[PDB]
Amino acid sequence: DFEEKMILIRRTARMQAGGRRFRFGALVVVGDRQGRVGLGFGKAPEVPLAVQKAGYYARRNMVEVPLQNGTIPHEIEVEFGASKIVLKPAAPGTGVIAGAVPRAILELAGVTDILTKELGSRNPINIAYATMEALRQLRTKADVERLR
Amino acid sequence: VKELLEAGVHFGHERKRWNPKFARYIYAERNGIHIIDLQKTMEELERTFRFIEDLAMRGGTILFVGTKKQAQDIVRMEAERAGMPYVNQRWLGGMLTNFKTISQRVHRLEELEALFASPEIEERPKKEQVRLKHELERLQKYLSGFRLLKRLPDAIFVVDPTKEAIAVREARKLFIPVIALADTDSDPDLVDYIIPGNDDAIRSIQLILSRAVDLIIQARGGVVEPSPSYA
Amino acid sequence: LTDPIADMLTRIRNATRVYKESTDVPASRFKEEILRILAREGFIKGYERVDVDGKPYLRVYLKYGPRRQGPDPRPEQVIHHIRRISKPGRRVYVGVKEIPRVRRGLGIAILSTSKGVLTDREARKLGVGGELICEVW
Amino acid sequence: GRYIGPVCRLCRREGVKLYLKGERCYSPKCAMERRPYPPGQHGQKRARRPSDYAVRLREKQKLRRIYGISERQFRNLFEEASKKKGVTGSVFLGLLESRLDNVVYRLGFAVSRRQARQLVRHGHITVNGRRVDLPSYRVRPGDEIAVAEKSRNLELIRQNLEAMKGRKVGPWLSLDVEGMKGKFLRLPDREDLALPVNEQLVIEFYSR
RNA sequence: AGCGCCGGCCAACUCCGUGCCAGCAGCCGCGGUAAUACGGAGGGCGCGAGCGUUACCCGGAUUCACUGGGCGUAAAGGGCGUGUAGGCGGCCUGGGGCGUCCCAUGUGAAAGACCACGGCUCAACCGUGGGGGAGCGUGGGAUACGCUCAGGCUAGACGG
RNA sequence: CUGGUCCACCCGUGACGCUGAGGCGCGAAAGCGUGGGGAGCAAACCGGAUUAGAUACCCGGGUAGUCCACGCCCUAAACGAUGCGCGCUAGGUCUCUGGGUCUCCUGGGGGCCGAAGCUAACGCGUUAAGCGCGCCGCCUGGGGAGUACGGCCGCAAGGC
Numbered sequence A: 001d002f003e004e005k006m007i008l009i010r011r012t013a014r015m016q017a018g019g020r021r022f023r024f025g026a027l028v029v030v031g032d033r034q035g036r037v038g039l040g041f042g043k044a045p046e047v048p049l050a051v052q053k054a055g056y057y058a059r060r061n062m063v064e065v066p067l068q069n070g071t072i073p074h075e076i077e078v079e080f081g082a083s084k085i086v087l088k089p090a091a092p093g094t095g096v097i098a099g100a101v102p103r104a105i106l107e108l109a110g111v112t113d114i115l116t117k118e119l120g121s122r123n124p125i126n127i128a129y130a131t132m133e134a135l136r137q138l139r140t141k142a143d144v145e146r147l148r
Numbered sequence B: 001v002k003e004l005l006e007a008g009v010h011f012g013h014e015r016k017r018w019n020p021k022f023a024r025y026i027y028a029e030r031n032g033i034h035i036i037d038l039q040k041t042m043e044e045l046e047r048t049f050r051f052i053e054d055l056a057m058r059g060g061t062i063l064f065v066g067t068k069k070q071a072q073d074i075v076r077m078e079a080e081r082a083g084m085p086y087v088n089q090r091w092l093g094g095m096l097t098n099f100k101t102i103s104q105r106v107h108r109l110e111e112l113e114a115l116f117a118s119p120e121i122e123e124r125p126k127k128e129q130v131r132l133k134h135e136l137e138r139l140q141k142y143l144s145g146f147r148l149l150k151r152l153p154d155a156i157f158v159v160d161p162t163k164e165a166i167a168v169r170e171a172r173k174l175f176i177p178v179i180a181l182a183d184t185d186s187d188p189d190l191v192d193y194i195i196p197g198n199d200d201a202i203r204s205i206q207l208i209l210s211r212a213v214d215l216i217i218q219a220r221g222g223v224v225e226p227s228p229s230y231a
Numbered sequence C: 001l002t003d004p005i006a007d008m009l010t011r012i013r014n015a016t017r018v019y020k021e022s023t024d025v026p027a028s029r030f031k032e033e034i035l036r037i038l039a040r041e042g043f044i045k046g047y048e049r050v051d052v053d054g055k056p057y058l059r060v061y062l063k064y065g066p067r068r069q070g071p072d073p074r075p076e077q078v079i080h081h082i083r084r085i086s087k088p089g090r091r092v093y094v095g096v097k098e099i100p101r102v103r104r105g106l107g108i109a110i111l112s113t114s115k116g117v118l119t120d121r122e123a124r125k126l127g128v129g130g131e132l133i134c135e136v137w
Numbered sequence D: 001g002r003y004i005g006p007v008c009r010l011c012r013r014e015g016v017k018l019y020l021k022g023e024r025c026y027s028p029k030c031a032m033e034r035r036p037y038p039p040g041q042h043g044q045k046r047a048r049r050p051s052d053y054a055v056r057l058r059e060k061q062k063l064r065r066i067y068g069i070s071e072r073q074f075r076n077l078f079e080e081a082s083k084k085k086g087v088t089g090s091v092f093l094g095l096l097e098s099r100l101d102n103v104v105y106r107l108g109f110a111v112s113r114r115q116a117r118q119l120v121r122h123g124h125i126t127v128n129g130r131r132v133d134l135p136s137y138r139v140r141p142g143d144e145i146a147v148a149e150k151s152r153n154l155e156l157i158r159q160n161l162e163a164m165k166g167r168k169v170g171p172w173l174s175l176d177v178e179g180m181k182g183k184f185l186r187l188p189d190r191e192d193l194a195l196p197v198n199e200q201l202v203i204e205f206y207s208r
Numbered sequence E: 001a002g003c004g005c006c007g008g009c010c011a012a013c014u015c016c017g018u019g020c021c022a023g024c025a026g027c028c029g030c031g032g033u034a035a036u037a038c039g040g041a042g043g044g045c046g047c048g049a050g051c052g053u054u055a056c057c058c059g060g061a062u063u064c065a066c067u068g069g070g071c072g073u074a075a076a077g078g079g080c081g082u083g084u085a086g087g088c089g090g091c092c093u094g095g096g097g098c099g100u101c102c103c104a105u106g107u108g109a110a111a112g113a114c115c116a117c118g119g120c121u122c123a124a125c126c127g128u129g130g131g132g133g134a135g136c137g138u139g140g141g142a143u144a145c146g147c148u149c150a151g152g153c154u155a156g157a158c159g160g
Numbered sequence F: 001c002u003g004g005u006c007c008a009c010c011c012g013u014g015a016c017g018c019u020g021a022g023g024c025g026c027g028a029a030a031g032c033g034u035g036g037g038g039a040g041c042a043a044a045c046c047g048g049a050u051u052a053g054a055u056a057c058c059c060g061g062g063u064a065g066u067c068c069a070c071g072c073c074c075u076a077a078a079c080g081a082u083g084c085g086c087g088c089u090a091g092g093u094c095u096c097u098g099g100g101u102c103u104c105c106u107g108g109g110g111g112c113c114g115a116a117g118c119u120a121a122c123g124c125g126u127u128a129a130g131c132g133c134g135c136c137g138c139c140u141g142g143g144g145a146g147u148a149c150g151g152c153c154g155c156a157a158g159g160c
């Protein structure tokens, strides 16, 4: 099993004659607090199905984040559309310093020490993905040498 | 197993309607046509077959796809011969990516073979017989080579990767490695184990797919002698 | 042409992003000294002085990672990132104590110093500073 | 000054017993034993999902409520920890611990930190000889924490000294009963205390 | 023992009264007879000899962007040329060493700040010690890039 | 009479280059001054219709003007709503104009479709809106307002 957090749940709507009709959107991150996180956004005619379906995709999309004493190996900046995420290495005491969105991802990934900043569009969805694709580009001292 | 005058069989084709990633597999261009270096085709047939072999000798499945009219029939022959699945007719969308749902249609196919072997009611109305049977032929047309697939292939073999881009797509999303014969209109990097050859001439579609099936049986348990080819 | 150096680095980035085996940049005993860092640190296979239409060039041999699994089989880059720091528009100079740590050590900053072209590591070693040519990782 | 009101509602709101009383804390007449739901008209109503903000406030209030300390004083310590070398969460708990009135309650001289205050405040306590009646004295390693000689002979302190005879006391402390004196051995490793506090969530409260 | 708050942001919910009125309000917005949003009440949350409001400064504001933004359609390319100042500038070789970089040395008061210790029962406050810095003067040194002088070249540019 | 520009030859010069605040020139139409010219057209204006009305649309008329010379004005959806130069990053098809060994190749233009990549999207994509360097111009919520004041230009209208 995995540990799960609901980052976002939103109602959307579409028009047709006679009225508007809703659908729900569930941004869920899921992880083991020991180097494995997954982000999934799930939509359905009702709330919990969406939260379920979210969690489903969440697993069907993971990433192996190279923790290091609970911090990430290096500075990293990523832009997903107009959203930007900054990740910066932090020493033992620091805590996770971030907004909920990139927090929820970093805690459930087992980060315990990091400095972050959102820049640009701070739409949670895009920020979510931007933080994921960020982690996904983390490299270790090894990773680099093997590569080169 | 490999043979060498496939030059008598194909040497490829297609004028500048080419994809340029396929540059490396081209010697020169002749009658206003791209001519495929056979020496490269060799280098590759080997490395491809090596992969094919390992898969047979571990008893692992191959999905055979070809629907361009030319490679159409020769996949019913060559794949049945290997006791392996194929899609001959239309390549339904989501066969790998939505396997369990597509297959939920094969249980229907079986279920008609069982129901329509006889009897368990022929006291069902005249129209329904007609109706149900019409359905039966239907599934049979597309799903015939598919039922042999009871699990996600351990690989897939494709005749035109360009033409069967959807197929290659579905595999890559699943990490199912892709084997294909591919003439100069194709994106090479998109294939894992690659056969740079004419993909439109049945001469060639024949040679390559057969010797494939041959290597499939020869390493699986047996050997066999000539199989069917239309003149 | 206003920045021979940037021009080079860009010729590389541009090539590396469509996965060319090599690309040639117009030769310079300074451009070379930078490639001599780029290869040594293992960012490129290396370079060789060639000629194109009678004119001196440096053919630069590019390096990447394995083929990959997934719908996008393109390999990771070895040069993920390379960009001018100092430029003709704004020369950028650092004393030794203020040489940046690129990417937590995993990348380098080539620098022209009066003890030749060095990396951060190398500079700090001989303990000198200089114009910060660029950054790679 | 400090909280000085109904103290059971605290535990009830925090959803956890904080041992803010001494004796009654351990009986089945404890509030949290009878009504382990939050104080007031609405405690029986079904809780709705606490916000991230909510959560960290609560954790901080809890850690704070334990020590009965004013919010300013709490804050000033936490900052002090953020300038102080090492892991802030540790040092914060450590510095919270090195307070006189806590050490006194730690070394068992009283049943409630509340009672352990009035003890220091009423000058019944001493450190290294000298009398000290400041509940906030930051106690260092080596310090001898006595009962006042003139206070040694008192009912309350007697009854409370008697309850300590073979009760073992944190790895960072020594207690010499009869001799009525104790010792501050070192600053507490985090493990050495086991409070219902994710002190991490506290750092996070103050980083907003 | 007081003061603010309990619609969302933001921690804290029920009853009555009122009925687009009286009123709240920092933004979104609340009130037209079942208002968690007005007023009172019970209850709750936050602080506590304080709590709140108003004003002003930095912050959040990567919203003047050096770090660290932009200009087809969101605000944003000059109507187009020509050209002064300026800014910027190809390959090779030497001299100079202005920028740049290194070392030494002077200066960089005291207080403050930072680390240690110590005195007022603690603290605030206060004392003793320690640690440096940019920056600028001076002496010495380096020469890759920028500069400058000098000599070559032909890939830029110009011409036949 | 005269400008731009492209090709081929690879003959000459030896970085003589890029951009460019100011400045200077050019700048559709309408408009303006003086003098011509005036067939067609046609603001203004007259009348007929349409219409609830119809200072319009439609119909019959009609003067500036439209045309020429000389001097002004200096605007614009003056648009690719895309500043200039250079270098680098797949190709496919149509086309204009050169030079070739004339199947085909190679330049310089004009279109479409598209690799990578970009982009909020729409779309851009060797004619970049891609990846980069140089310089210039410009944006910083909507209205108020391209208004006011001041200054400079203009015969005025008006422009900056």
Ligand code: SF4
Binding pocket: D007, D008, D009, D011, D012, D016, D017, D018, D019, D020, D021, D022, D024, D025, D026, D029, D030, D031, D032, D033
């Ligand atoms: S623990 Fe002591 S303080 Fe908390 S409720 Fe039970 S009794 Fe009151």
Ligand SMILES: [Mg+2]
Binding pocket: A064, A065, A066, A138
């Ligand atoms: Mg990894």
Ligand SMILES: [Mg+2]
Binding pocket: A080, A081, A082, A083, A084, A121, A123, A126, A127
């Ligand atoms: Mg975004």
Ligand SMILES: [Mg+2]
Binding pocket: A079, A081, A082
């Ligand atoms: Mg962007």
Ligand SMILES: [Mg+2]
Binding pocket: A089
């Ligand atoms: Mg570190």
Ligand SMILES: [Mg+2]
Binding pocket: A122, A123
């Ligand atoms: Mg926002």
Ligand SMILES: [Mg+2]
Binding pocket: B160, B162, B163, B183, B185, B199, B200
């Ligand atoms: Mg084909």
Ligand SMILES: [Mg+2]
Binding pocket: C085
């Ligand atoms: Mg910079």
Ligand SMILES: [Mg+2]
Binding pocket: D019
């Ligand atoms: Mg306890």
Ligand SMILES: [Mg+2]
Binding pocket: D052, D055
């Ligand atoms: Mg949390």
Ligand SMILES: [Mg+2]
Binding pocket: A093, D081, D082, D083, D084, D085, D086, D087, D088
């Ligand atoms: Mg600290």
Ligand SMILES: [Mg+2]
Binding pocket: D193, D194, D195
């Ligand atoms: Mg305890």
Ligand SMILES: [Mg+2]
Binding pocket: D206, D207, D208
């Ligand atoms: Mg802060």
Ligand SMILES: [Mg+2]
Binding pocket: E004, E005
């Ligand atoms: Mg308040």
Ligand SMILES: [Mg+2]
Binding pocket: E010
């Ligand atoms: Mg608050």
Ligand SMILES: [Mg+2]
Binding pocket: none
């Ligand atoms: Mg709340």
